[PDB]
Design a protein around this nucleic acid. Structure first.
Lengths: 84, 150, 82, 129, 208, 190
RNA sequence: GUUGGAUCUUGAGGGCCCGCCCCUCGGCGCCCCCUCGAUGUGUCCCGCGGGGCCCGAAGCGUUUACUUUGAAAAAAUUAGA
């Protein structure tokens, strides 16, 4: 900072790069998404940082694999939050 | 500040402002209550139920559909675990450390660790006793810790 | 520094600043203003009538001053290509 | 963690002001902080503030001015029966001609000049000048 | 401001800038130069914003104007590349010139073999003209300076983003400065550009 | 059937009679049959706003509101057409437990949560006015003068629906509480 | 032992100030008695005086510390007329 700035409506790239609880208006950026993926024949809702796998009846096993960060997905997928 | 762990970091999620999540499909009260009842039949903790509901169903927390949370539903029904989930899992660690300590009597680390976990149980339990979630006439013991986890 | 209803105590009235809202005291070093010339515009060629900004010891030693002058100058006008 | 919230806010502003910085993020945000800021603001010691609302506990962004010299906190609070106010005022303020001791009275959080008129004492929060 | 169309730049300047290699900057992150930056070149290096370079140059120029004697602005360079540069500026504008070594104490020292009386200093890099920059803040003198993204900003009032080390970069900025001050007050007049080329400035350029 | 829409012990008439007749029409009207046939509003109140059209504030006891909110924009659009430019919305009013003072009466209390208190009711009213966007966040700006204006952030997706509404929402809030509300779009999504 | 996060509502008069909002009394009133005007053991203006019940008001709802006003608070001393 040049040490005299005052910011009352901060840009969303210096507030969206920061840690989840360090944000200047605190809501996380995590979302839900619909996964289509072709070996599943139903539209499974999945959490972006799912943790434990989401699975469904339509697939044998192919929907998610676990990852500590963002959940792994396989083949065709979409995402829309929608409205967080 | 932490006197219950040697940590320095964080261990909670950020939570959103709103009382409605995600607002494109929040399902209905009916669906998730049935699911909760069926999961709680199997003896699953509120933690586990929250995880599976979040990711698979279009609900996140069930606090955003109705003002009740998973524990509150359970508690009012009268079908609930018989001690808080955290307290259970604490007791369970102290059992596991105790079993390891029986195996090895040269493991100084394990002795130190056991003390810490046990202290942590007592402070949490004291809190539950005062607010009538535990009876004051129960108390933590080696003996009874085993019996709970089994 | 007034006394009573508006009697004058005082040896002099010091300069102020508006880049940090702090007075320039009493004989201090690195305290100078900055007269930027006005230009009359449109026909060009300097016409009076200085715009003056007051710079204090404090701001300069904390290496603020560059940015500050622009904020002060822009806010009250006027320089081409704003 | 935080056993006083006034003390953190007051320091935060002063440390900003030293730099020439015109913003702070104070938190956890409380009713007393709002009240202290408004009385301070009215006399011109600080500029306007804006309370951002979260479900955590709130966060306030104060735009400050350098019309302040020191806002001190009297922690732990003491009783003032309007005959220790005089003792404080000579002790801890540079003159009796300016500066306010700000207290909390049962008739509201008020500056000590107003306290003197009411003749209602209470607990001393802090001061500024 | 002035008459106004060519003080919002023009293609002529944008060509001169690109040619002189002004545009490239350092690789050190900023906190006082950061505002000025247009965009960052891939894997470090900052592209300075010519729009910002303009406005600062004009504000600088304007401050030299409103003095009816141009002698009491000291143009200072200790850099080789800018020795010729400042010498031409002094001929043109009528500045009192300081090329090569400054020689410590000319704004200080009551007993000295030289003394100069300025009112405003113009510096080409305040990490090479560090002696004037320090000396000036002992005797209450404002200092403009040509600053990159790793120059000191302490005791500098108005910075002008620019590479301002070596090549034609130091030359060109002296040319454009001289052109600007002459527009407002000189004999180019009417806020239109110089008929002198920047090549009279620049460095000596080893003579074959 | 409307039979309770006008009864409230209010002296008018004019607007309530209009609204009650409107309710009967809507009961039969397509895609709104079988959801107004058992749910009939307690009262209607008319208060003006700075848009130069009057605003019709309808009162719901909270259970009704869910059905009204479901449709909202389409229903309000029809009612605006019907009443020639009046802006219709739905506001929820709870009983609200008495003041935590003492004198001036503190009546009967039993535990008063912060989800049924005076502030909670005002927040709930704000939420109810909108439908296709939600309240992302809020900020209140305290002016140097001493005035406060509350900027209510709304979702930056599906915003259009609330954009035209804004002026009436501002005015109605002012009439009811004595505080001005203004609406804004943030900097979250995108 | 010490210390401890956020969070609950109170328009006029005059050029601030006042009461308010999201039953032992006084008394809006209702019923009683000597009755007060329609009347002179007694009404239908009313509880006005004694009552009961019961609203703006008020114990109101659950406690305080604090602070504020009173009393109770040796003379000499001491400040001080």
């Amino acid at each position: 900072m040049p040490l005299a700035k005052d910011l009352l409506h901060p840009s969303p790239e210096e507030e969206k790069r920061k840690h989840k609880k360090k944000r200047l208006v605190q809501s996380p950026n995590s979302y839900f998404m619909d996964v289509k993926c072709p070996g599943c024949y139903k539209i499974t809702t999945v959490f972006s940082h799912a943790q434990t796998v989401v699975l469904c009846v339509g697939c044998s096993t192919v929907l998610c694999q676990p990852t500590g960060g963002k959940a792994r997905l396989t083949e065709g997928c979409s995402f829309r939050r929608k409205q967080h | 500040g932490r006197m219950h762990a040697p940590g320095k970091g964080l261990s909670q999620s950020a939570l959103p402002y709103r009382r409605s999540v995600p607002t494109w499909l929040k399902l209905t009260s009916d669906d998730v209550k049935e699911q909760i009842y069926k999961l709680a039949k199997k003896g699953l903790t509120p933690s586990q139920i929250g995880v599976i509901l979040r990711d698979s169903h279009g609900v996140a927390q069930v606090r955003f559909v109705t003002g009740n949370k998973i524990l509150r539903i359970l508690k009012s029904k009268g079908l609930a675990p018989d001690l808080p989930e955290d307290l259970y899992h604490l007791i369970k660690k102290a059992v596991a450390v105790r079993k390891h300590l029986e195996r090895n009597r040269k493991d100084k680390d394990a002795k130190f660790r056991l003390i810490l976990i046990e202290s942590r149980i007592h402070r949490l339990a004291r809190y539950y006793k005062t607010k009538r979630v535990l009876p004051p006439n129960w108390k933590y013991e080696s003996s009874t810790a085993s019996a709970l986890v089994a | 520094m007034q006394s009573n209803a508006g009697e004058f105590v005082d040896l002099y009235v010091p300069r102020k600043c508006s880049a940090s809202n702090r007075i320039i005291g009493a004989k201090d070093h690195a305290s100078i203003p900055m007269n930027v010339a006005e230009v009359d515009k449109v026909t060009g060629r300097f016409n009076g009538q200085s715009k003056t900004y007051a710079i204090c010891g404090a701001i300069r030693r904390m290496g603020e001053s560059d940015d500050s002058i622009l904020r002060l100058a822009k806010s009250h006008g006027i320089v081409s290509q704003n | 963690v935080r056993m006083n919230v006034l003390a953190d806010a007051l320091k935060s502003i002063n440390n900003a002001e030293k730099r020439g910085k015109r913003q702070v993020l104070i938190r956890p945000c409380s009713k007393v902080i709002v009240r202290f800021l408004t009385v301070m603001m009215k006399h011109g010691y600080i500029g306007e503030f804006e309370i951002i609302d979260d479900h955590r506990a709130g966060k306030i962004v104060v735009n400050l001015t350098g019309r302040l010299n020191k806002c001190g906190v009297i922690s732990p609070r003491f009783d003032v029966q309007l005959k220790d106010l005089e003792k404080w005022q000579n002790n801890l303020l540079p003159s009796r001609q300016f500066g306010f001791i700000v207290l909390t009275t049962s008739a509201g959080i008020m500056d000590h000049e107003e306290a003197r008129r009411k003749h209602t004492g209470g607990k001393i929060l802090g001061f500024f000048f | 401001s002035g008459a106004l169309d060519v003080l919002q730049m023009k293609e002529e300047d944008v060509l001169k800038f690109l040619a002189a290699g002004t545009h490239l900057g350092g690789t050190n992150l900023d906190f006082q130069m950061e505002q000025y930056i247009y965009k960052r070149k891939s894997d470090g290096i900052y592209i300075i914003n010519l729009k910002r370079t303009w406005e600062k140059l004009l504000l600088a120029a304007r401050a030299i104007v409103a003095i009816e004697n141009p002698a009491d602005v000291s143009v200072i360079s200790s850099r080789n590349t800018g020795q010729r540069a400042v010498l031409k500026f002094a001929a043109a504008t009528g500045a009192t010139p300081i090329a090569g070594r400054f020689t410590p104490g000319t704004f200080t020292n009551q007993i000295q073999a030289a003394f100069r009386e300025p009112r405003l200093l113009v510096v080409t890099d305040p990490r090479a003209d560090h002696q004037p920059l320090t000396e000036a803040s002992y005797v209450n003198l404002p200092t403009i300076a040509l600053c990159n993204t790793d120059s000191p900003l302490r005791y500098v009032d108005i910075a002008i983003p620019c590479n301002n080390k070596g090549a034609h970069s130091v030359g060109l900025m002296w040319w454009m400065l001289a052109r600007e001050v002459l527009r407002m007050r000189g004999t180019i007049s009417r806020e239109h550009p110089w008929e002198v080329m920047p090549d009279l400035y620049f460095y000596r350029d080893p003579e074959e | 059937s409307a039979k309770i829409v006008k009864p409230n012990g209010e002296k008018p008439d004019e607007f309530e009679s209009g609204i009650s007749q409107a309710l009967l029409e809507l009961e039969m009207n397509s895609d709104l049959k079988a959801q107004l046939r058992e749910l009939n509003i307690t009262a209607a109140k008319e208060i003006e706003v700075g848009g130069g059209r009057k605003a019709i504030i309808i009162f719901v006891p909270v259970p009704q509101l869910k059905s009204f909110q479901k449709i909202q924009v389409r229903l309000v659009r029809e009612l605006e057409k019907k009443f020639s430019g009046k802006h219709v919305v739905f506001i929820a009013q709870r009983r609200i437990l008495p003041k935590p003072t003492r004198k001036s009466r503190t009546k009967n209390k039993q535990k008063r949560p912060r989800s049924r208190t005076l502030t909670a009711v005002h927040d709930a009213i704000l939420e109810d006015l909108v439908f296709p966007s939600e309240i992302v966040g809020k900020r209140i700006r305290v002016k140097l003068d001493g005035s406060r204006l509350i900027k209510v952030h709304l979702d930056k997706a599906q915003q259009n629906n609330v954009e035209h509404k804004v002026e009436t929402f501002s005015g109605v809030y002012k009439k009811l509480t004595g505080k001005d509300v203004n609406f804004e779009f943030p900097e979250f999504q995108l």
